[PDB]
Design a binder for this molecule. Structure first.
Ligand SMILES: *[C@@H]1O[C@H](CO)[C@@H](O[C@@H]2O[C@H](CO)[C@@H](O)[C@H](O)[C@H]2NC(C)=O)[C@H](O)[C@H]1NC(C)=O
Ligand SMILES: *[C@@H]1O[C@H](CO)[C@@H](O[C@@H]2O[C@H](CO)[C@@H](O)[C@H](O)[C@H]2NC(C)=O)[C@H](O)[C@H]1NC(C)=O
Ligand code: A1CDW
Ligand code: A1CDW
Ligand code: NAG
Ligand code: NAG
Ligand code: NAG
Ligand code: NAG
Ligand code: NAG
Ligand code: NAG
Ligand code: ZN
Ligand code: ZN
Lengths: 497, 497
């Protein structure tokens, strides 16, 4: 079969070429400028991989984000991805998507903010305009007083940040198991819950999400939000439709201010710890908001730790209720599903129910590669999998990110969008850190700008924009992309090759 | 309405899940009534341990480092059942790493003319010298007999030898916390034993111990990688590879004539992939000759040693294609270690492409295979079994939580797989039971039971290199062992009725 080296080379290159064509982005044809940028990216990628391989040292893009963040930021591939327009971030949580630094430097400088140390020795924050809060399990102190008496305000503010962020130490070392790091993650939300549900802080925090995401060259976001319970200084507690209206008004003002930004849409989330009786009411609520806020309210999702809590099947009559009405109602679902290392259990079989329920996208889908028939349904229906790589590493599904279970999905061209999940919780950027690790760890050394470009286009093409909005957003994205290519050729001194 | 009732929903759900069950390894097996009684007990135990980890929020011990899991698994019913179970064959083993370090200590280092020294890295080394102490090149050699007699504690002395040689004295994931640190320790182990284990009578007896130990773990057949080379006598005489093969052939014949309940052994010549292509060319020609003159005992050729930093298959391609280019062609079988890596799109994982273009009979490890869909197709189409060595892949730095092992998605697609132990002597594993336990508990799901075990066992004979007559006989023998195991198991676990 191979009398000479040319025949062997031809067969080898046919097989390898077939796989390169099959994977995400493999059918893209780059133009001549894109090819110059691609050649540089591929030279850079090869040099870091070959150094790790042949000089026998760890591959930094795949280690704990705690260790790799400060390392990746100085490299050309990272700087290119930082400049690159991302399209959309489609998997985000609204209390976890702006900087803890803003909570500290802005929110905790507002009037009537209190702090206490809880019984686990973490700081909690809240607002009370009607006296200090009751000493229920902790002793509340006015932040303004504690800060002014600290003797070192910079250290005091840095201590707040350090006590709240999950990247203050390496979570893989400090919280070295799934349930320990989920204990720390849940705790983070408890620390901020009081302050971040105060209505004007909540409003301004959401506006900060939009500002930070635009600043990372993201033009569109879909965000999970609980919507409900925002409270005023006088103790007024608002309902979920108010919370939705609040976000709508902020988004409209943001898009008026920044016509280079496509905007935002919202998914109602509820934690999967509640009785089925209550989930039923949240489904009904979501049916009403979907009918009355078409094109801003998207649908429903169930969140919180997947392994120990209620499965989709545990809520199946609630989730089937819209489809069973006369006439039927198609309430879109965005289920977090298969965020687990388990196989053949109630947890990863959530992926089956997600498909039976016609999920528009799947959150995480870490277990999906263990399910060949679910993979085929995902591919044939075009159900995008929202892949959140830093989240899956820090929250205990994988250590070396080259073992991330989405790499084999991308190799088969399962539809995938990259997102950051909870970037504010662990000091990530809106998209650039997660896109970097996806690019360096979840695809191969010979995968270049075509993969980046496809993942960026995917985030618009599998968004929940209607077809007209998608066409408008792609025109804007194409203009950004063209500017990014020209700028990059100038910046990396590539124009003459 | 697609699902107006619970029955309509569960019908669809169960057909989908069942369709995946039929597709995975073992999915077409129909257990008889006795097998079903045992299977029901295995599945109750499996669910009990998984549900405890999941709902009581504690780590799943079958998936943690073997250093931690070994003593815990050994007291459990599922482990004890797998221990009693006939394994069929171990198809991926190295002949200097497949018997107990305890035997090296209690037997080999009690022989005349055995010397020890501490090397510059503070590790003990052992060798044989018939003339006097070896030249004190980078260490000071001392007669082991004298050192033992003067230790002041013989049992502590022997225990220290074992502790200084074993990779399971501490947890390698802690003590050597990177791929290249643990490969440094693994390489060191071979250097520690190399002198003593290449002395001819010790090497003969160590190979016999491999056979005895594997038989004792209810393994009836082995295929073994060996260098065959450099076996040396007390007077300094160094034997050629053909002598090493003839030596193993005689040990094997005596063993099978002693034990009709054991099917036997066959040998694969291995060469380390750090050598110049001229050396590999000589070993390829050697392998052609031994394949011709020892049919049915000499199987073919393999390249071993660390895959990432050393020479690729393509680096030796002129040598590896040489048999097929003879007139008339000569079809030298290959059993390449391939894709034992976390890299993607590099020279290392593309070894999988060359392994299939060179018509490999089986592939060793294939850890990267799930990232290569076109290679998967060829592996399935041609029946090229992947030798999966789960404890080895964890301890030697490819994966931490074995539920992330890259063979679980292969098994879910019914890629042909055999489980093996690789270097069980190096880290105190049993011949097969520990690896079979971690494969069963980590690489398939909670609802996968005795049918998966039975299929992996049968696979190890079906994808052995036995000829038609041998294989028919071995499968009849395996069936008999299996029936005895089922009957004994029902009595032992009080499952009758
Ligand atoms: C959050 O802040 C508290 C209060 O400063 C930290 O408590 C300190 O913890 C270290 C180590 O546990 C001790 O040396 C100090 O004495 C503790 N101080 C007090 C007042 O208890 C706590 O470690 C912080 N938690 C995190 C996760 O950063
Ligand atoms: C192999 O044995 C040597 C010699 O006993 C060990 O070196 C000792 O390491 C201990 C750690 O417990 C030190 O306290 C001693 O000082 C060391 N002794 C000497 C003479 O250096 C070495 O650690 C062992 N290596 C392994 C991998 O077990
Ligand atoms: O109720 P809130 O909106 O104030 O808190 C946010 C809610 O979202 C949950 N969540 C946030 N990031 C994730 C979540 N869940 C599951 N997978 C991991 C990750 O993707 C936590 C809390 O229940
Ligand atoms: O020279 P010897 O035969 O005495 O030592 C054995 C030779 O096999 C090598 N080896 C042993 N276990 C494996 C090996 N290689 C690659 N992957 C991991 C594992 O599967 C080490 C040495 O080169
Ligand atoms: C390994 O390191 C040396 C020295 O730092 C460097 O010169 C060399 O290029 C590196 N090798 C690779 C393949 O990067
Ligand atoms: C906080 O943000 C608000 C609204 O965006 C702004 O008015 C105010 O000045 C900020 N506070 C600080 C301390 O920057
Ligand atoms: C899912 O969508 C299909 C195709 O539109 C529709 O026929 C079916 O009724 C839907 N199923 C559910 C459970 O809502
Ligand atoms: C959790 O642990 C408790 C205490 O050992 C035990 O009673 C219970 O059965 C456990 N739950 C599961 C599902 O194993
Ligand atoms: C070592 O093994 C040989 C070969 O089986 C046996 O004859 C000899 O007695 C053994 N040595 C010891 C100390 O048992
Ligand atoms: C591989 O096997 C095929 C089919 O049996 C045969 O035609 C071909 O010559 C072989 N190629 C090599 C390189 O041995
Ligand atoms: Zn999420
Ligand atoms: Zn091996």
């Amino acid at each position: 079969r191979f009398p000479t080296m040319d025949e062997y080379t031809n067969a080898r290159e046919e097989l390898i070429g077939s796989e390169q064509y099959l994977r995400v982005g493999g059918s893209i044809n780059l133009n001549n400028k894109e090819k110059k940028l691609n050649q540089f990216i591929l030279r850079e990628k090869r040099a870091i991989i070959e150094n790790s391989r042949l000089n026998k040292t760890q591959y930094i893009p795949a280690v704990s984000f705690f260790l790799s963040k400060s390392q990746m930021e100085s490299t050309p591939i990272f700087k290119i991805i930082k400049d690159m327009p991302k399209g959309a971030a489609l998997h985000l949580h609204d209390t976890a998507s702006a900087r803890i630094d803003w909570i500290v430097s802005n929110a905790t400088y507002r009037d009537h903010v209190y702090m206490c140390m809880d019984q686990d020795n973490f700081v909690r924050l809240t607002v009370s305009g009607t006296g200090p809060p009751a000493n229920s399990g902790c002793e509340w102190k006015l932040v303004e007083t504690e800060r002014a008496n600290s003797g070192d305000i910079a250290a005091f503010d840095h201590w707040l940040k350090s006590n709240i962020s999950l990247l203050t130490t390496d979570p893989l070392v400090t919280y070295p198991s799934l349930d320990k790091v989920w204990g720390r993650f849940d705790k983070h939300f408890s620390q901020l819950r009081g302050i971040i549900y105060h209505t004007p802080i909540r409003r301004d925090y959401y506006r900060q999400i939009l500002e930070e995401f635009r600043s990372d060259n993201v033009q569109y976001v879909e965000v999970r939000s609980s919507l409900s319970g925002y409270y005023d200084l006088d103790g007024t507690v608002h309902d979920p439709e108010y919370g939705l209206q609040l976000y709508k008004a902020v988004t409209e003002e943001f898009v008026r201010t920044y016509p280079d930004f496509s905007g935002a849409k919202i998914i109602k989330s509820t934690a999967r710890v509640k009785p089925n009786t209550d989930i039923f009411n949240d489904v009904k609520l979501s049916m009403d908001l979907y009918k009355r806020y078409p094109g801003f309210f998207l649908g429903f999702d169930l969140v919180a730790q997947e392994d120990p809590n209620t499965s989709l099947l545990g809520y199946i009559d609630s989730l089937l209720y819209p489809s069973r009405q006369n006439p039927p109602v198609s309430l879109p679902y965005y289920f977090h599903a298969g965020e687990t290392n388990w196989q053949g259990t109630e947890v990863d079989y959530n992926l089956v129910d997600a498909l039976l329920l016609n999920a528009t996208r799947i959150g995480h889908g870490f277990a999906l590669i263990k399910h060949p028939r679910v993979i085929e349904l995902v591919k044939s229906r075009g159900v995008a999998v929202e892949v959140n790589p830093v989240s899956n590493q820090l929250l205990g599904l994988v250590k070396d990110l080259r073992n991330h279970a989405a790499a084999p999905l991308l190799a088969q061209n399962v539809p995938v969008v990259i997102s950051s999940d909870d970037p504010g919780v662990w000091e990530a950027l809106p998209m650039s850190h997660d896109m970097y690790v996806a690019f360096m760890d979840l695809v191969g050394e010979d995968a270049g700008l075509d993969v980046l470009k496809q993942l960026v286009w995917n985030s618009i093409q599998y968004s929940s924009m209607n077809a007209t909005e998608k066409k408008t957003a792609l025109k804007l994205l194409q203009a950004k992309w063209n500017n990014f290519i020209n700028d990059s050729l100038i910046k990396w001194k590539l124009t003459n090759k």
